[PDB]
Every structure is written in structure tokens, then in C-alpha cells.
Write a protein that binds this ligand. Structure first.
Ligand SMILES: [K+]
Ligand SMILES: [K+]
Ligand SMILES: [K+]
Ligand SMILES: [K+]
Ligand SMILES: [K+]
Ligand SMILES: [K+]
Ligand SMILES: [K+]
Ligand SMILES: [K+]
Ligand SMILES: [K+]
Ligand SMILES: [K+]
Lengths: 184, 184, 184, 184, 184, 184, 184, 184, 184, 184
DNA sequence: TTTTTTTTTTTTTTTTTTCCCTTTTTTTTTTTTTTTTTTT
């Protein structure tokens, strides 16, 4: 089962070499730091899909070790909330990485909205920072300044077009139902 | 049993390929954000059915790791309640994903009603956010902006009609009873 | 034993297909929401019987993980009580679903009566919300607005008549005693 | 699995000899100490990649044993935050090293930003200090004064150029998917 | 695995004889005690390399049982910080030694800097004091007064020169990758 | 492994008879008690080497069960610190001895120095007092008044000279590396 | 190992018969009770050696279950400290005996000295009282008044002379090293 | 081992019949109760020897489950201390008996002396009361009033004379050493 | 061992039939209740011997689950102490019965004496009440009013005479020593 | 052992049929409720004997899960004490039933007596209420109003006469001793 | 509606010298609507 199954030679080598890869502009995005300059990041769903491909839908697993709200302050109608989380990612072989993530909500005037934003942002950031420690392909290269410089030296491509023809349109999945009924 | 049974090759590949799928307009819905614009989401029962199909009624499992009420305030007859929950989803192979969810009740004047709403909303939202991490088919694509743009470029279909002819009308299920009596 | 026995292929497929079923008007009921309109629900005993049929009298199990009284207030002779519970339902294979339920007693003037109502209501509602996550047949469809619209489009039949001819009239059950004495 | 698999003779000897290696100028960087002089360090991603190469993506693992915020002070608009973390690195054979790391944010005026910086910096510093105890190749030589003196006597090379031609550009990894589908 | 593998006769005898050795002037260093005189010590990285050679990179392991900040005082701008740690070193056979170490930062005016210094110094000192109990070769002789007297009677040699020709210059270690791919 | 391996007859008898031995003047030292007279003791490193020889570098193990600072007082610039520790020594066969040790720093004016001294002295004293309970050879005879009287009746020898010719001068131990590479 | 090995018939009978022995004047000593009269005792090292002979260096083991300082008072410069300890002695067969011991320091004016004396005295006294419960040979006869009366009726011998000719004079023990190297 | 070894038929019957025995005047003693009259008891060492004979040095075991000081009062210079203990005696077969014991020190003026007396008296009294529950031979008959009446009807013999000829006079026990060396 | 060994058919039937017995006047005693009348009881040692005979010295076992002092009051020099205990009796087959017992000391003026009486009386009374639940022979009939009425209608015999001829007069029991030495 | 042994078919059927029985007037007794009327009950020893017969002395077991004193009040010399207990009965097969019982002492003026009564009554009542859940034969019928009506319609017989001829008159039970000595 | 007597002696000399220089930059975008009457 999970945590017990050991990696085969082919799977190991494939995952290792694929994890030494770096990401292309189709993954990186850009924000405007406060007082700073253009910073580069990788969106959450991007890292989630990257993990689900590298390891499988059941090859990796994450958990919230602890989430703690640091502070909640109120300045003339604005709610400032700081929240941190500790996400631990674990592979089916037993290997594991754990790291912190933070969430920040300074502008809003609704306490519930600020907390909703902060906690989810903290958990997502922690998941990103914990998946980082597996290899460049999972976000370890986003902190390599030379990698960023070489990313600036690439054509700034337009957003990719998503084809919604073969999108999921009904509940039943006979392809899965068949294999699972035969799985007993 | 659950947590011990390992996925077979056929079941694994089927589930993986089905989880790389994206959802169609028949699942997405729309709300009006306060001050913002049209946002897209997936209703709870939709994700629940998606999971029950992808993995089975006994292929997935969720649990409330911890639920904590953040605050309960009262402003001139209005009860403002913030509540968060931590849902952990686990597959029969042992793989698991855990994420937060929030519930918000600002309008009502009854404390009990506001708390009921906040807690149930928090648990359901946490279940959604935890099932997201399995693949686009289970809600990971709802955060892909390009996917949303391509969703706007599709015919806005009218709500589907539900056929209540073959609906369940009595308690006993002999189809199940037979197999279960023979299961001993 | 319970939690250890694994589902057979026939039982699995039967339960899955039976859980894709939707319920008929013979189960749904109606209330008048405060300030809102006609809402639809499913009575407790209905869901209990549905579960006892889908899985068996010993195929499903529930437990109260935690029940916590949120508040107890007194306004000029009226007791307002809010209570929540956390019910975890588990199948004999180990699969499990856990969700919250709430109980509310605002009108009554007896504290004991209000608490008696609130706690039992919370546990029953939590059991319903936890059994929901197994499939449409167990109450997951009650939240589908299209399903409700199609429910309005059916003849609203009068309450069913209960036949009390073959009702239990004595203690001893020789049918069971025989099998159990031979079960050693 | 992890913590159980034992090192083979070839793997052991290779890792040992590779860990006796010292690092070149392509890894070391430089900062300006307050009141002091040019100090040398190793960037986080550098050590992360070094570990992922020496042991494998699943050959090493780290965890946060405990993180505690030491203090949070406010002096006329400036937030001074001290935070410490305890990282424990473990190899697939069961060997483990644990050490502290610190994070410091004195300048910023936003509490949330200061804490975000401090906690992540503490965890990363702890990971570096814990990976140090495996050999010179993982950062143990950065404290050898003679090694630093000999580093100053080398040509100060220009930042390395990163080749983004073969960078990862899509989600699916058929090389990995193949081996994993055959791994069942 | 670690904690389970037993020492062979050859490894045992080799380690024993190597641990009865005493160290040469190439390892000892000197400080100026406050109010006292020239004291002799062994730098941290030295002991780390000594252990990684005597036992192997995966033959020994250490852990922080507990670290507690004793005091934090402030005298007219000067921060005096005392911190202690408890390090437990363990060999792959199960043998273990645990001892305290202290860290001291009296001069600095920044609280964060003083704590950063104190905690890391405490952990390193504890690791040294815990490795002392294995033999003279690992630092047990630094307290032998006759050994120090004989050290003074040796030529005070100039710092050794470090050769950075064959130093590690890239991430990949094919020597290790080969054996690890063959380790399956 | 450690705690599991049982002593053989030869090892048992050898250790027993060697532990019935008493120590010579080459180990005993002398201090000046406050108000008292010449007291005799055995230095820490001496007992450490004695244990590492009697049992082996991996035949004995010690641990700090608990260390608690009794008091920290300040009298006109002088810091008086009392600290106690509880050390438990255990042999590879499972036998164990646990005893207290104390550390005292009355003179110093720096709190950090006094605490460092008290804690380290307490742990070392506890290790000595715990190793005492194995036999006269490990310090049990230092409390025999007749043994001390007979020690006074011996020639007061001059400090031994330490030969630093064959002292350890490099890191690598090919004698050990060979056996360890063959240990797989 | 310890706690598992069972006593053989020969070992059992030998230890049993040897424990019925009573001690001679070469072991008993004398003190002057305050206000009372001459009391007789057995020194600590005596009992320790007696145990190490009766059972072996690895046949008995003791541990400090709990030590609690009862009081610390100060009367015009004199420190009165009471301390108790609970020592549990256990044989390799699993048999165990636990008893209390007390330590008292009333005269001294240094708190650290009083505590140092009290705690060690308490633990040693507890070890004596716990070893008492094995037989007269280990100190159970010191409370037999008739035995004391018969002890007074013996020639008051002069202190025994300790022969320091064959005393241990160097670290290495080739006799033990031989058996231990052959123990693999 | 202890707690596992089961009693043989011969040993069982022998112990039972020996435990049905009653004690003679050579064991009973007499005190003067405060305000009462002559009371009869069995001295501690007597019961200890009785147990060590009935079961063996390794056939029985006792432990202090908990000791709690009830009160410590001071009336015009006199210290009144009450202390209770809970002793649990256990045989190698697993049988166990647990009972309370009390210690009392009212006269002394030193707190440390009173506590020293009270705690040891409590533990010893608890050991007596716990060994009582094994049979009349171990002190269960001391509470039979008819037994006391018959004890008064016996010749009050003078204290027995103890023969100190064959008393233990040296440390080494070759009879035991032989069997233990052959026990491997 | 104890708690594991199962009862044989013959032993079971014998114990059962012997436990249906009622007790004769040779066991019952009488007190004068305060304000009440002649009450009947069974002394402690009687029940202890009864249990040691019915089950064996190692066939039954008791333990103090909890003892708690309810109150300690002082009225003009008189100490009124109430104490309760929870005794659990267990047979070697695993069967167990647990019941409370109380101790009362109202008259005495010494706190220590009152507490000693209350606690020991509470534990003994609890042992009696816990052994009651095994059968009439062990004290269950003392509460049958008809049994008491029939007890009054019997000749009240004078206390039995105890024969101290064959009483135990020395420590050694060769009958037991033989079987125990042969038990290896 | 207890809790593990499974019931045979014959034993099961016999116990079941015997548990369907109702009790006769020889067991029921009567009280006079305060303000109410004649109430019917079953004395403690009655239920104890019923259980010891139905299942055996080692077929059932009871335990006090928790006992808590509800209140102790004092009104002009009268002590009003309420106490509750929770008794859990368990059969050798593992089946168990747990229920509450109450004890009440309102009249008495002695606190210790009131508490003794309340606690013992609570435990006994809880044992009765917990044994109720096994069948009518063990007290479940005392709550059947029709059963009470039919009980009033029977001849009120005079108390039965107890024959104390064959009562137990000595300690030793050779009938048991034989089987137990042969049980090894 | 249940539970009502048990107990009171040991216990008392031990230690005591160790431990002192580390450690030096990392990290900044998420996420968005659920829920419905129940009991004696
Ligand atoms: K509701
Ligand atoms: K009642
Ligand atoms: K009583
Ligand atoms: K006493
Ligand atoms: K003493
Ligand atoms: K000292
Ligand atoms: K230091
Ligand atoms: K830093
Ligand atoms: K951020
Ligand atoms: K929301």
C-alpha cells in the first residue's frame, strides 16, 4: 500500500531524470512585489498537476501538520491577518518533505473573508514549498537567479488555448468501472 | 481492507487518465462576488458524485481532522460567524490529501442558524479543496484562468432535466441482497 | 470482522449501481423555511432504513466523534440553544465518511427540553450529512436543484399506507435462534 | 521502503567518496556582514539539488521537528522578528541528522511579511545546517577557513548560463508513466 | 537498517584501534579565554569529518533531544543570551551517547543575531561534547593535560594549503547514480 | 544490535575480572576541598577511556534522563548556580545503571559561563557516578578509605609523557574504510 | 539479554545459598547518632561490590524511578535540605526490588554543596535499601538486633590493608579485547 | 523470565502447604501502643527473609506504585509527619498483591529526620501488608486473635544467639562465579 | 502465566461447588453499631485465607485501582477522617471483580494515626467487598437476612484453640527449595 | 482466557433459554417510596448469586469504570450525600454491558458514614442496572408493569428457612486442592 | 433499598573539580455560495 510500496528501477530513474528538468515559460508567472520589482512564481494548480504527473494521483500525498493564525489586527476598518501552515508531502515509498507556508490578507474589511484567504493561501504556499524540495521540475529552480535571467531571455508567449471538446461531461466512467470491477 | 488494498495496473491507469480530464459547463456554476465579478465554482454534490465514480463508494474516504470556530460577533442584531475545517481525503491504497475549508455566515440574526451554516459550509469547502489535489477532473482546473476563458467561449446551456422514472421507490434492494448473502 | 472484511465484486457492483439511483417522492418531505420558501428534506428513519438496506444491518456503522454545545442563552423566558455533533460513518471494508450536524432549540422555555432536542437533532443531522457522501441514493441528490425541479414535476402522492398484519407480536425469533445455534 | 532499505556496498562507497569532495566557486556566494566583511555561503536550492543528487529524490528526507517564534517587537514602525526551526534530515537507510536554523526580519514594516520571511528563512537555514553533517559536499567545508582562503585564490568566474532548450514544457511525462504503469 | 545493523569484527577492531589514536597539531586550535589564558579546542567541521570517516556518512547519527533558552537579558544596549542544547549521537549498531552543549552571545546589540549565534553554538558544542565520549580520536584527548603539554612541544606549523583542482563542480554524480540504479 | 546482543562466557569473565581491578596513582588526582582536606578523584576523560576499553566504543552507552537547574542566584555581582543531571549508562547486553551528578559555579560574574560550567559538570559527574556501579576498575574503589590510605603509601610519580609521533594526522582511515566497504 | 535470560539451576542455587550468608566485621562500620548511640552500617561501595559479585557486572541493574526535593530552608546562614529518591534494582531474569533513600545536608552554608550532598546521598541510600531485599548478604541483616549483639562479641580488627601491586595501571585490556574480538 | 515462568506442581503444592503454616514466638515481637496495650508484630527483615525463602531471591518482586506525603506540621518546635506508600508484590508467575503502608514521625525536631523515618517506614509497612495476603506464614496470622491468645500460652524464650563463624568475609564467591560462567 | 492460564474442568467444578457453600459461626463475628444493634461481619484475615485456599496463593490477585482521601476535618482537637479505596481482585484465568471500601477514624486526636487507620481499613474493606462478588462462600451470604436469622439459631461456640506445635519455627523450607531447584 | 474464550453451542442455548426466565416471589422484595407506594426490587446478593450461577464464578466479571461524588451538603446537622457509579459487566466471550447506579445518604449526621453508604450503594446499584441488560432472569423483568401485576396475584409466602447444617466449617477444600494439583 | 470493625514500628554516613570561540542570505499571489424539521 501507500508508504510501503518500493520504487522499481525504471520508475526511479524516470522520476529522477524528469525531476532534474527545469520548467518553461508555460508554467512561470509574474507578480509585482510591494516596493520591489517583478517576481516570478508557479501557480498552485500547476504544482499540483506536476506532482500528479511525476508521481501519480496515488504516488504522492500531503498533509497539514499544523496551521496556526499568527495575528489578527484591525486598523481603521481594515483587517490584517497573518497565518502560517506546515505541509508534509510523502511519496508512496515513504520519502517525505515538510515545509512552511504563509497566507496574508491585509486589505479586506471582513474578518471571515480575510481568514478564509489567509488560511487557504498558507496551506497552498506550504504545499508548494514542500514539493519544491524534490527537484527543479517541481519548483526548486524558481529560486535560481540564473534560471530567472535565462527565462527573461525567452519569447514572452501568449496564454495557451484550452480545448474543451473532450472535457468530462457525465458522471459514469465505464473505463474505470470495468477495471475496478475486475480488480476484485 | 481500506488503507491496505493496492491499486491494480488497469484501475490505476484508468483513474489517472480520467483524472487528467477537464470538466464541462454541465458542472460549473456562477456567483456574484461582492465588489468583484462573475466567479466560477463546482457545487459540493457534484464533486461528491465525481469522487464516488472515479474511485467508488468505498474507494475514497474523508474525515474531519479538526474544526475550530474562529470568531462569533454581533453588530446591531447581525451575527457574523467565521468557521474553518480541516478535511482529509484518503484512498483505499493509503494515499491521502488534506486541506482547509471555510464557512461564513454574516447576515442572519439567529446564532444557531449562523453556526450551522458556517460549520457545514466549512466542512464541505474543505472536502472540495482536499479532493482538488487529485486532478483536473476533481476540481483542479477551476483555478486555471485559461480554462475559465475557454469556458466562457462555450454555449451557455440550460439546466439538464432529471428523469425520475427509474428513481428508487422502495427500501429493499434484492440485487444487492443476493450478492451480499452469497458473500459469506 | 467489521473494518476487515473486503467487498466482493458482485456486492461492490450492486451497491455502486444502486447508489447511482435517485429517490422518489415517497421519501422526500417539505418544510417552510423562515423567510424563505418550501424546502425539501429526508426524514431520519428514512435514511437509516436506506443505509440498513444498501449495506446491511451490520454492513454500516456510525459513531459520535465529538459533540459540543456551542451556546446556551436566555432571553426573557426563551431558551436559545445551539449544539453541533461530528458523526463518522464507516463500512465493513474500512471506508469512512465524517461530517457535522447541528441541532437548534429556540422557542422552548425549559432548558432540559431545549438541550434534549438540540443534542439528538445534531447527532441525527450529522448522521444524515455523513451518509450523504456515499451516493445519490443515500441523500446526495437532495441538494441537486434540477432534481428538486423534477420532483415538483411529479404527482405529489398521498402518504403511503402501512400494513400492520405481519408486524412483530412476540419476543422469540426461532428463525434467528436456529441459525445462531447452528452458527457455533 | 524509506527508513528500511539498506545501502549496498557500491552505493555506500560512491556516496562516501563523493561526500569527501569539496565544492567549487560555482556554488559559493557572498554577502556583506553588518560591521564585518565579505562572508561566504551556499544558496538553498544548491544544497537541495546536491542532496537530491547524492542520495536521490527519495533517498533523503527532511522534517520540521519544531518551529517556535522567539520574539516579535515593534520600534517606531520597524518590525524585528526572530524565528527558529529544527529540521531533521533522514536517509532511506535510517541515518539521520538534526540541527537548528534561524530566520531574521528586522527592516520591514509589515508584520505578516516579516513573519513570512522569518519562518521560511529559519526552516531553510535549518535544512542547510542539518545537511551539513553528511559531508563536505553538502556544505560542511564552508566553515573551513583554509578552504575559504584557497577559494579566494581562484578566478572569480561569471554567473553560469542556464540552458532552457530541453526545459519541461508540458504536464505529461510518458517516460515516467510507462515505468509506473509497469510497476504494478 | 540504521539502529539494526550490527558491527562486523573487522570494522569493530579497525574503529577501536583508530579511536585509541590521538590527534596532531593539524586539528587543534586556540582561543583567548576571558580573564584566563590560551585554551585549546577542535572546530566543529573537523569533528564532523572525523565522525563521517570513522563510522561513515550513514554509520552515525545525531539528534537534538531538547534545546532550551536559559535567559535573555539587556544591559544598556548589549544583549546577553545563554542557550543550552542536548544532542544524542547514535551509531548504526544502536550505541548512543548524549551530552549538553552551550551557546553564548554577550556582545551583540541585535536580539535576533544573539539568539542565532547562541542556539547554533549550543547545538554544535553539544555535538562535540557527545562525540567526545567515543574515544581520544574524536576529541576525548583535548582534556588530557599531559597531551596538551606534549602538543606544546611540537612544531607550530603553518595552516595547510587546500587543493581546489579536483573539487566538486557539477550536480550530477554518475558514480553514485550508477550504483543506485543497480541497487534495485 | 545494542541492547540485544548477549555476552559470551569469555567476554563476561574477562570484563568481570578486569572490573574487580583497582586503579593506580596514574589515574587518581587531588583537589583542595573548601574547608576540608586533600580529596582523591578520577578525571572524566580517564573514566571515559576506561569504559571505552572495558566494554568497547559501542559496548556501552549513556543518556541524560533529565537535567534540572536547581537555582540561579546573584549576590553583589557573583552568580551562584546549582545544576543536577541524571545520567543512565547501559551496556549492549541491556544492563543499565543510573545516577545523579551535580555542577557548581559560584565565582564567575557571567551568567552564561556559570550555567555552561554547572550543566556540563553535572552531566560529567553523573556519567562518572553511573559508571562507578560497574566495578572498582571504573571508579568504585575511590570511596574505599583503606584504598586511599594505601594510595598515599606509594611513590608520588611525575606526570606521564605523551608520545605524539604516531598520532592521527589525516582524516581518511583506509584500515577502517576497507573493513566497512567489505561489511556489506 | 537483560530481563530475558533465565537463571540456570546451578546459578540459582549458588546465588540463593550465598545470599543467606551474613556479613563479617570487615564490612560493618559505625556512626554516632545525634542524641542516640553507636549505629552500624555498610558503606556504599561495599554493597556495590557485593552485588557485582553475587550477580555479576551485568547480572544486576538499578535505576532512579523518581527523585523529589522535599524542602530547602535557610536558618541564619545554615542551609537545611531534605531530598528523597526511589531506586529500583532489577536482575537479568526480570526480578526487581524498589525502595526509598534519603539524603540530608543541614550544616553547610552553600546551597549547591547541600544539594549535591543530599541528592547523591539519597540515591545511594535508596540503592542500598533496594539491594537489601535480596538477602542478608546484601544488607538485610543490619536490622537484626541479635545479629548486631553477636557482632559486638567479636575482636575489633584493624582496618584492612589494600594491596596496590597488581592494580590497574594502563588503559588497554588485551585480555578483554581478545574475547570481545572473538565475540563476533 | 520473571512474570512469564509458571509454577510447577511440586513447587506450587510445597509453597501452599508452607504458607498454611503459622509462625512461632521466634518471629513475633511486642510493642506498647500509645494509650493501648501489648501489640504483636513481625519485624521487617523477618518478613523479607521469609519471602526470600518461600519464593526465592528471584521468585518474588516488589515495587512502589506511589508514595505520597499526607502532611507536614510544626507545633512549637516538634515536627509531625505522616506518609503513606503503596507497595505491589509480584511472583514470577504473574500473581500480585498490593496494599498500603504508613510511616509516622511525631517526636523529632528535624524535618529531614522525620521525613527520612516516615517514608522508609511507610514503604516497609506497605511491603509487610502486601506480603500478608500470601498466607499465614508471611504474616496473615498476626491478625487472628485466637492465634495471639495461643501465642501468649507459649514459653517466652530468650532472644536467639546468632553464629558468626561461617559469615561472609570476602567479596569473591567462586561457587557462584563457577555456575554463572557455566550459565552461558 | 497469571491472567493467561485457563481453568480445567475439574478445578472449575470443584471451585464452583465449594463457592456455593455458606459459612458457619466459626467465621462470623459481631459488633455494636452506633445507635443500631448487633451487626455481623467477617474479619479480614479470614477472607484472605479463604481466598488463598479456594484459588491458591497464586490463583488470585488483588490491586488498588485508586485510593482517595475524601475529607480530613478537625473539631476541637478530634480528627475525623474519611477515606475510600477501589480494590480489583483478579483470578489467573483473567476474571476480575472490583468494588469500593471505606475507612473511618473519628475519635483519635493524632492525624497520622487516623490516616493510617482510615486508609488501611478502606483498602481491606474494599478487598472484602470485591471478593464478595465470587460466591456465598467468600462473603456474599452475609447480606442474606435469612442466613443471619438461621445463624442466630445455632449454638454460639467459644473461640477455637490454635495449635502452635507444628508452627513454623525457622526460615529455610527444604520441601520448597527442593521443588524449586528442580523447577529449572 | 477471560475475554477470549468463545461460547459453545450447548452453553449458549442453555444460557439464552435460562435468561428468558422470570423471577418468583422468593427473589423480589418491597420498599415504601417517599410519597409514592409499594415498590419492588431485587437485593444485591440475589443478583450476584444469579450471575454467578448463570455464567459461573469465572464466566462474568465486573469493574468500576468511574465513580464520582455528585454532592455533599449539610443542613442543620444532617448530611445529604449523592454519589454515582458506572459499572461495566463483561462475559468471558468479550460481551459487555455498562450502566449507572446511584447512592443516597440523606438522614445520617456522620460524613464518613454517609459517604461509605452512598458509594457502596452506588456501586451495587450500578452492578444491578448493568446486569439488567442480559435478560429477564437477571432483573430485566422488574420493570415490566404486567409482570408486577401478576406478582401481586400470588400467595405472599413466608421467608424461606436456611439450613446451616452442611455449611462450610473449615478452610481447606481438598476437593479443589486435588483438581488444582492435577491441573499442572 | 445497601451496607454495617481495622489496625498499630523501623531506622538511620557520603562526596568533591570541569570546562571554554561559532557562524555567517532568504523569500514574496489565492481564491471564491453552502444549506435546510426533530424528539419523547
Ligand atoms: K436543521
Ligand atoms: K434506588
Ligand atoms: K466500616
Ligand atoms: K505503624
Ligand atoms: K542516613
Ligand atoms: K563536584
Ligand atoms: K563554548
Ligand atoms: K542567517
Ligand atoms: K506569499
Ligand atoms: K466561501
Amino acid at each position: 500500500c501507500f508508504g510501503q510500496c518500493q520504487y522499481t528501477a525504471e520508475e526511479y530513474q524516470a522520476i529522477q531524470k524528469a525531476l532534474r528538468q527545469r520548467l518553461g515559460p508555460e508554467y512561470i508567472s509574474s507578480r509585482m512585489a510591494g516596493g520591489g520589482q517583478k517576481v516570478c512564481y508557479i501557480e498552485g494548480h500547476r504544482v499540483i498537476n506536476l506532482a500528479n504527473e511525476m508521481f501519480g494521483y496515488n504516488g504522492w500525498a500531503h498533509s497539514i501538520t499544523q496551521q496556526n493564525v499568527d495575528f489578527v489586527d484591525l486598523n481603521n476598518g481594515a483587517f490584517y491577518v497573518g497565518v502560517c501552515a506546515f505541509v508534509r508531502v510523502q511519496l508512496k515509498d515513504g520519502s517525505y518533505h515538510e515545509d512552511v507556508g504563509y497566507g496574508v490578507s491585509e486589505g479586506l474589511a471582513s474578518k471571515a473573508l480575510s481568514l478564509e484567504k489567509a488560511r487557504k493561501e498558507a496551506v497552498t504556499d506550504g504545499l508548494k514549498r514542500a514539493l519544491r524540495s524534490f527537484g527543479n521540475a517541481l519548483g526548486n529552480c524558481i529560486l535560481d537567479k540564473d534560471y530567472l535571467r535565462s527565462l527573461n531571455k525567452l519569447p514572452r508567449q501568449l496564454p495557451l488555448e484550452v480545448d474543451l471538446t473532450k472535457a468530462k461531461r457525465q458522471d459514469l466512467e465505464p473505463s474505470v468501472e470495468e477495471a475496478r470491477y475486475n480488480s476484485c
